[PDB]
Design a protein around this ligand. Structure first.
Ligand SMILES: O=c1[nH]cnc2c(CN(CCCP(=O)(O)O)CCCP(=O)(O)O)c[nH]c12
Ligand SMILES: O=c1[nH]cnc2c(CN(CCCP(=O)(O)O)CCCP(=O)(O)O)c[nH]c12
Ligand SMILES: O=c1[nH]cnc2c(CN(CCCP(=O)(O)O)CCCP(=O)(O)O)c[nH]c12
Ligand SMILES: O=c1[nH]cnc2c(CN(CCCP(=O)(O)O)CCCP(=O)(O)O)c[nH]c12
Ligand SMILES: [Mg+2]
Ligand SMILES: [Mg+2]
Ligand SMILES: [Mg+2]
Ligand SMILES: [Mg+2]
Lengths: 173, 172, 173, 172
C-alpha cells in the first residue's frame, strides 16, 4: 500500500471495448429466448465501470442491481449491502471485475442461489486461473491473465487508479 | 394499521421471567461442555428484549450479535452480523415464529458460513400458522392463533416496550 | 485484547435495576405532556440490554429503533445501519451504554438532528467525564464513573462479557 | 408502473459522450491544483453509468466511492461510503435532479464529515420541478419537464441499460 511504483498499459482501452462488445453478443444470445426477467448484479466497488459498459452492449431488456460483500486472516463473507430488487424466477448474471481466489464470489453465488433464480451465471472481465482456491462456475470471461498485479477499470491499488480507462500493470520500483 | 382495538394480557411478566429462567438452564446445559466459542444471534428488531433477558440467564461465556432481515418476496439482509460465526456454536434468538418463512431463509444464509452448530431459540411459537417446517430446539411458549404484542413485538410500531405479552382485540 | 485478566463486580445487578427505575420516572415526566410521538434510539450493539430494561420503565407510549455507527486512527463516523422509522416531528431519546470521548455520539446526534425531530436528548447508562473530547448535551445519566475499564451489561472486552447482568471491572494480571 | 408507453430519444448517445467530455475538462481544471485527495461520490443506483464515463474523463488522481440513500419522509442511509472524506475534495455525482430533496439532505450529511470542499455534479437537471434550491456547480443538461429514462435512470426498474437519455410517452 506504501511502495514506489508506476503504471504501464497492459490491456488498452480499445481492446477492452472490443472484447466487451463480443461479450455483449454472447450474453445476448444466451438469454434472448428466455422470456423471464433478467438482472445484472454487480459487486461493488470494482464492477461499476465494467457494469456500465457491459449492460449497454447487452441487447436484452434487463434490470441493473448492486450488492457489496465483506472484504478481508480467513473471515466470513458478510453482506454490507444487499440487492434492492428480488431475483427469484429471474435470469441473474453476476458481473465481476476480476476473479483470483474466487472465495467471495463462490459464497455470493451460494447466497443468491438460496433465493432460487431461474438461472445464475457469472461474467468477469479478468480471470486469474493461477490464484484459484475454490472452483466456481464462470460462464463468461473477458481476459485470462497470468498472476500479474493489475489496476484500472474499477480495480484499485490503495484506492487508486479506479478511474483508468485501461487495464494497467503496476511496476514496483 | 389504524384500527380501533384493545390489548388484553396473554402472558404476564412473571410468567415470561420464569420461563426465560428455565430456557436459560436448558441452553446452558446444552452448550456448557462444547469447548467452542458460542454466539447468540438476535433478529432485529423484535427480539432485542428477549435477547437481553435470555443471555443474562445463559451461564456460559458467549458473544452477542444481531442481524436485520427483510420480508411473497425474497429475504434480504439489511444489516449483517458484525462478527464471524465459522466454527462457533450459534444460537438464533427470535421473538416469534408464525409462518417460519423468515427463520427458514435466515437459517439457510447462516448455515453457509459453516458454524460448528446452528440452533434456534424462539420465545413465542404459533404453530397453527406455520407454512414451513423449521426445526426449533428451544420454545418458550406455543401460543394460540392470536395477534400478539409487547416484549419487542409490535403492532404498527406500537407496544414494543410492554413487559408482558398481550393480544390485540379489535372492536366490532 | 489478549491479556490475562479477571472480573469483579463494580455496580451490582440490583443497583442497576434501581437506578434504571429512577431514570424511567425522570424520562416519563419529561415527555408525558408532549403529545407528539416518541422514539427511543439505541446504538448497537452496546445499548441492547440497557434499551430493553429502560424502555420497560418508561411509562409513555413510544417506539423502539436501532442504528449502528462505524467504530474505529481518526476516521469518519459512518452509518452501517440506519433507523427503520422516521423521526421528524418526534421526541427522540438516544440510548447509549457509555460515554467516554463522545466523538461518535456527537456525530450521531448531528446526523439525526438533520431529520428535524421535535426534541433530541441523550440517555446514557455510564458516563466518564474524564475522557470527554467533545462536549455533548446529555440530559440523563445513570452513573458517573472514573476512568475505569468496565465491562458487562452490553459493554464488551474483545467481544466478551456482554451478557453480564452487572457492570464489572477487569483486573489485568 | 404498468402503464402502456413508448420511449422517444431526448439526448442521443453521441451528445452525452460529447457533453461528458466537456464536463471532464471543467472538473479537471478546477481540481488539478488542489494538493488534497479527491473523491467522486456516486448516488446508487441511477448514477453508476454516469460515474463510470465521467471519472474516465477526469484527468486528476482521485478515488471513486458510492452511497445509497432512501426517500414526504426522512432521507436515510441504506449504504454509507466505504472510505473517509475528511479533508478531501468531494464531488457528488448524481444522475438527475428534479426536486432536489434527496441531494439537499445527502449534501448535509456529507458536510458533517468536514471535507475540504463539497461540490455536486449532475448529468440531468430539471429546474421546472425544483422544490429546494441546492447549489450545483456542474450540469450536463437542463431538461424540459419530461419523465426521462436510460443511462442509469429507470422507469419501474426498466431501461437503465440504454446508452441514451429517452423520454417516456404514455398512450392515450
Ligand atoms: O491484481 C489485483 N489488484 C487489486 N486487487 C486484487 C485482489 C483482491 N480482490 C480485489 C479487492 C476487493 P476490495 O478491497 O476493493 O473490496 C479481488 C478478489 C476477487 P475474488 O475473491 O472473488 O477472486 C486480487 N488481485 C488483485
Ligand atoms: O402475532 C404477531 N404479532 C406481531 N407481529 C406478527 C407477525 C409478523 N412479524 C413476525 C413474522 C414471523 P414469520 O411469520 O415470518 O415466521 C414480522 C414483522 C417483522 P418487522 O416488524 O421488522 O417488519 C406475525 N405474527 C405476529
Ligand atoms: O471501558 C470500556 N470498555 C469497553 N469499551 C470502551 C470504549 C470504546 N467504545 C465502546 C466500543 C464500541 P464497539 O467496538 O463495541 O462498537 C465507547 C465509545 C462511546 P463514545 O465514543 O460515544 O464516547 C471506551 N471505554 C470502554
Ligand atoms: O425524469 C425521471 N425519470 C426517472 N426517475 C425520476 C425521478 C425519481 N428519482 C430521482 C429523484 C431525484 P429528486 O426529485 O429527489 O431531486 C428517484 C428514484 C430513486 P430510486 O430508483 O432508487 O427509488 C424524478 N424524475 C425522474
Ligand atoms: Mg470484484
Ligand atoms: Mg423476529
Ligand atoms: Mg455505545
Ligand atoms: Mg440519483
Amino acid at each position: 500500500r506504501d511502495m514506489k511504483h508506476t503504471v504501464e498499459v497492459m490491456i488498452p482501452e480499445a481492446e477492452i471495448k472490443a472484447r466487451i462488445a463480443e461479450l455483449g453478443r454472447q450474453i445476448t444470445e444466451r438469454y434472448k429466448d428466455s422470456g423471464s426477467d433478467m438482472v445484472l448484479v454487480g459487486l461493488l466497488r470494482g464492477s461499476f465501470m465494467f457494469m456500465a459498459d457491459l449492460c449497454r452492449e447487452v441487447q436484452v431488456s434487463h434490470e441493473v442491481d448492486f450488492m457489496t460483500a465483506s472484504s478481508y486472516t480467513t473471515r466470513d463473507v458478510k453482506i454490507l449491502k444487499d440487492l434492492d430488487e428480488d431475483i427469484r424466477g429471474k435470469d441473474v448474471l453476476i458481473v465481476e471485475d476480476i476473479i483470483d481466489s474466487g472465495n467471495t464470489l463462490s459464497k455470493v453465488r451460494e447466497i443468491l442461489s438460496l433465493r432460487e433464480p431461474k438461472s445464475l451465471a457469472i461474467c468477469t472481465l479478468l480471470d486469474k486461473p493461477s490464484r484459484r482456491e475454490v472452483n466456481v462456475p464462470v460462464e463468461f470471461i473477458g481476459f485470462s491473465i497470468p498472476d500479474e498485479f493489475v489496476v484500472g477499470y474499477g480495480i484499485d491499488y490503495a484506492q487508486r487508479y479506479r478511474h483508468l480507462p485501461y487495464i494497467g500493470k503496476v511496476i514496483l520500483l
